[PDB]
Design a protein around this ligand. Structure first.
Ligand code: NA
Ligand code: NA
Lengths: 227, 103, 103, 103, 103, 103
């Protein structure tokens, strides 16, 4: 459906277009596998906000309302003269953090929804400007946004995320429902570091697969017919 | 001149409209001799062809046949919802005469 | 030589500008013999055709007719905002002569 | 008329289906004289060609050979999953007769 | 042979480089007889045409004219940054001879 | 028949491989008479052309030249990584004979 998510960010629209979307920390471009960032939802969710709304460990966090994103924005970016609140379509790269991490969600009141690998420019509907902390209510629409494609999609179900939860190898969660049914090899079940390596490799595979879908959606419009 | 696919389809004998309102599930393309054609399916199992060019086609249709194959490939790749197909239902599989996309 | 669609349109008899400032709502294409054409609609109900190539067209237009059908298909799929259409109003639906796209 | 790539493939001598269910790993294209062709590979090492047009091809296939090269290029660039290839196995690399894409 | 658009442009009389480093603001295309052409603008107001094919063109240019119109349409739709245009300044609007894209 | 661009390239005397493993930095296209061509560059400064069609080309290459220009444009726009180019090095800039794309 056409549900939206929201995120305050000092990175301006020009930078986001150049970067191919809203990136997690340490990632300069959306499609650049280059060298691989750590991907771990549990670590992402427990990251502290300094200059950015949570964007570490391979995910980019969003809120479920403009009001929430704005409030969170002002606690973090109040020193910025101008920042942006990006308006983001729901799609199956998004995981509801509370649902995936369950009782172990670290900031459950935040009700965050996090994009694995960041948010492609084509998934950004538009943006608001915020001045010193004061919201400009003018919604600037993103030309590169694809409405029919994204209005047909929802966030990922939590069951697609339980195996990506990223809890510590020996954490209780891996031997409990629901995660026990999704635990990567080495996570609560039978070379050191298997759980961490598998969690990472599962995240990379998810992102590789998801990127293929985005490429298909955008690049199919560069096809110029002949004869 | 018709103003929509339904009225266009009704100008021809042995046609029907299929209302799919769904993306194409599969796209198949062949260059094999005498089977230079495309086949599409939908997830409900409905199967449609773009016919091999033949004596049932007038010269003006040759370019349109090529265009239709182009359209089905890009519709498939972009997951565009197909609204309706006009087909000749006296062929097996049904042979595409026209396509509409909306929504 | 005209510098914009409005001035171009005014060079021809029986034409008018439609101002849409909207994406295409539906795209229809036909390969049926003597109806090798495209039809587009907008959400306001406005309907337009790319005419079947015929004796009303000079040879230089044949390639441009094919290009226009290409343009409408990709505009539809990319949800590109159509600014204006220049159309012949002595056909039903109105027949596209030119298109402008701007946001 | 066949309704799927497997049945189409069975109409020809010296063919087989490869089931890949994977995106194309590499795409190569050449305009060098007598090697006007495309080559694709998959990550399993499987390698396939679209043959240079020649006397083994009938006239109706010439346009289809060009279309197939177009399809492979855009499939490569979009990372579209290739379901099956129908190939002639009396050439090295195996020569593509048909492609299917789903999922 | 020139290695860049600036050196290419200098090979011709009555040309100049425009450096835009910007996306195309509008794209207009016409199929009307004797005005089978494209026009683009940039947000600074600069306006450029791809000329109607005519006796000022040699045969080898005909395909390149078609290609250029393809390039401008896809650049427009994808918001691709145009670096430079090489144009003939003895036409109004200035007539595109070459385009470069970067960044 | 070669199975990869390196082996293809070695079939000719006046060719060499360049290994780029990089996206195209710039794309230039010209319709100017006698310079109906494309030029690409990479960020390291390497510059390549698709030659103007001429008497050094056999008829089978003419379509492949057009296809190559199509390939370079879409590779540029999609930022697809070019693996290798096979080029004729008796031209300046080096003239593309084949391209491979892989990540
Ligand atoms: Na959605
Ligand atoms: Na376990």
């Amino acid at each position: 459906n056409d549900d939206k998510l929201y995120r305050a960010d000092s990175r301006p629209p020009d930078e986001i277009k150049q970067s191919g979307g809203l990136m997690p920390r340490g990632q300069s471009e959306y499609f650049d596998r280059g060298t691989q960032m750590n991907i771990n939802l549990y670590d992402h969710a427990r990251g502290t906000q300094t200059g950015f709304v949570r964007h570490d460990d391979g995910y980019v966090s969003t809120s479920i309302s403009l009001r929430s994103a704005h409030l969170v924005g002002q606690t973090i970016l109040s020193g910025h003269s101008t920042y942006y609140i990006y308006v983001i379509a729901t799609a199956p790269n998004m995981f509801n953090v509370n649902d995936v991490l369950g009782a172990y969600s670290p900031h459950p009141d935040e009700q965050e929804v996090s994009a694995l690998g960041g948010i492609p420019y084509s998934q950004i509907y538009g943006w608001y400007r915020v001045h010193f902390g004061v919201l400009d209510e003018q919604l600037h629409r993103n030309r590169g946004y694809r409405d029919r494609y994204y209005s047909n999609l929802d966030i990922a179900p939590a069951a697609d995320g339980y195996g990506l939860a990223g809890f510590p190898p020996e954490h209780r969660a891996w031997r409990e429902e629901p995660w026990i049914h999704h635990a990567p090899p080495g996570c609560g079940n039978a070379m050191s570091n298997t759980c961490d390596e598998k969690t990472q490799s599962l995240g990379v595979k998810f992102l590789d697969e998801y990127q293929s879908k985005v490429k298909r959606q955008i690049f199919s419009g560069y096809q110029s017919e002949i004869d | 001149t018709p103003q929509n696919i339904t009225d266009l389809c009704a100008e021809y004998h042995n046609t029907q409209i299929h209302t799919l309102n769904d993306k194409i599930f599969s796209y198949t393309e062949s260059l094999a001799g005498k089977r230079e054609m495309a086949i599409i399916t939908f997830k409900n199992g409905a199967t449609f062809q773009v016919e091999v060019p033949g004596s049932q086609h007038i010269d003006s249709q040759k370019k349109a046949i090529e265009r239709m194959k182009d359209t089905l490939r890009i519709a498939y790749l972009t997951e565009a919802k197909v609204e309706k197909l006009c087909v000749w239902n006296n062929k097996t599989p049904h042979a595409i005469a026209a396509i509409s996309m909306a929504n």
